[PDB]
Write a protein that binds this DNA or RNA. Structure first.
Length: 60
DNA sequence: GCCCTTAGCCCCTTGACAGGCGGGAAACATCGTGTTAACCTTCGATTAAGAGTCGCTGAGTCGCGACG
């Protein structure tokens, strides 16, 4: 939950390019939150430990 | 004029298909999942150039009195 709340701003930033695609902005954010929470379930110490890229891929 | 004999129509029995809904068996196009990890961790409209009224809130002005 801490990692999600400390990254939700990421989802907010990614949900700006999909605006006006059949879903509201907050709806898109709270839908991408599902993928974000699904990303933390599979997040190990692999190469490139930056969670930015992984989070943006899963929100997309 | 009535009875007998024979012909035509109606009805019954079988049947050789024809294919025809439909489940099965199969070959093939969906629909919900995952999974990848090289860089940005606040996006954006939209009234607001007429008009009669409902529902709430928060400032400045006064009484009643006590303690010197």
């Amino acid at each position: 939950k801490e990692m999600v709340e400390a990254n939700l701003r990421l989802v907010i930033s990614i949900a700006k390019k999909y605006t006006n695609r059949g879903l509201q902005f907050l709806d898109l954010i709270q839908e991408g939150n599902i993928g974000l929470m699904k990303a933390v379930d599979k997040f190990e110490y692999r190469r490139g430990y930056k969670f930015s890229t992984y989070a943006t891929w899963w929100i997309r």
